């Protein structure tokens, strides 16, 4: 995979998608349609179409952003330390396109792995289950339920 | 007419269209398709669909940005002093949505009125002549 | 209270005062003279001179920023949800001039209420005890 | 002459002085006191105190920024080309501290050499003639 050039991204991504995925902006809490979307399907990197999260692992955390127990696969995201007042947080980025997705927190539901991935909906595109074969994601349908 | 909220604009405009129209950025020289487009039709504000320029007034100034000799109507655009770089230039913005479009300089051909509007393609949407009726611009077909 | 215009503030505040208070910037760890300051006095809003913190409530655990356990009054600072970074933190702002000051965390000295006001020194002006009378803050010396 | 650390500049320069000198911002036209100041003295870099312009070379250009026919010394400024719409401008920066100062235009008075150094007052500090000895610029009083 080759990430489109920045010049291409400025012309294809909305300003919101660009700020979030390229400049690590955070979308307003509770603002995105995916925040309260719980329909079967997968969420893919808005930039590359890399699968990132399954609807099976999504839950309403009350935090303000699409929230997931885990990424759809171990290698689909990468984690990166950042700091505010020298206090660490873990940023989550997509593997292939290196889009800023969100952050991951150690206080998610224990019986699902203890983690909460709070992800900007702006970084994602939802592929409904019924559309996955056609979109080229058939081999990942099994992760949806 | 009411300009969409900034929130809506961020979710509707590309980064490029947003930076140019909202943040007064300037697209890269020769980068936009409208730089080399010379087909009959009109150029409207990408934000609002307000008519801005006629193809009739577009010419190839060669500088790297779409260039026109005049707005399609005097009131289609507004002029603003831009004191960037210790000089005074006239910024051109759209009337209704107040998008930054570009600048107008007094260095156009005199035989076409002497003004050169250097306008970002990013600020514009081209409506070809053949599509103007369907798009509600039928009354401006005579502006060509 | 009337806050000075943004133009006025650009010419009166230092770069870091402005960025912190007006643009909610965070000064670098250990950058500010107030970090380890323990002289008696008050810290006022650098924009308005509204009292915000007393030296009495300041402490140093080696944090990169001034640290206080409480504001000088309940009403001098306002709390605001800060949803940056897909989490919720509590930003603290000054009441009158609505300066960004920093944030308040629940990890401060247990015996003083549990809070840690982590405050940009750039948001504050220190008024030494000895100058408080002349400066109009005599009534507050008892908080020092 | 001397370029303080970015940290020192953030804490000493006003937001205006900082944005102008460090980030090549342009102050609003007609906004600075020095625009209409014509008193004997020199103008030094606000960052370093490096002498930059003499009041001897200062004139009213009507443009809205302090305007000079020449720098006080050949070596005290450096010049850099930039472009908008592929139109040339020439940025002027101080030699020692590399402060953004303003722009130079080929439209100055002919008898004085034809150049106009259009300089942000924000980038300067005026040292009146009668303060130059005490200020350490005695050697340059001949330039006034």
Swiss-Prot record, chain A:
**Entry GO CC:** cytoplasm
> Which keywords accompany this UniProt record?
Disulfide bond, Electron transport, Multifunctional enzyme, Oxidoreductase, Redox-active center, Transport
- Please list the GO biological process terms of this entry: cellular response to oxidative stress; protein modification process
Q: Where is the active site?
A: 118 (nucleophile)
MsrB domain residues: 6-129
Source domain of life: Bacteria
Record GO terms (molecular function) = L-methionine-(S)-S-oxide reductase activity; peptide-methionine (R)-S-oxide reductase activity; peptide-methionine (S)-S-oxide reductase activity
Name the cystine pairs: 63-118
- Give a short account of what the protein does: Has an important function as a repair enzyme for proteins that have been inactivated by oxidation. Catalyzes the reversible oxidation-reduction of methionine sulfoxide in proteins to methionine.
Q: Which family does it belong to?
A: In the N-terminal section; belongs to the thioredoxin family.
In the record's own words, the domains note is: Possesses 2 methionine sulfoxide reductase domains (A/MsrA and B/MsrB) and 1 N-terminal thioredoxin domain. The domain B exhibits a thioredoxin dependent methionine sulfoxide reductase activity; the Cys-118 is probably involved in the reduction of MetSO and in formation of the sulfenic acid derivative. The regeneration of Cys-118 is probably done via formation of a disulfide bond with Cys-63 followed by its reduction by thioredoxin.
**Extra remark beyond the main annotation:** The domain MsrB is stereospecific for the R isomer of the sulfoxide of MetSO whereas the domain MsrA is stereospecific for the S isomer.
- Which protein are we looking at? Peptide methionine sulfoxide reductase MsrA/MsrB
Q: Which residues of the full protein are shown?
A: 378 to 522 of 522
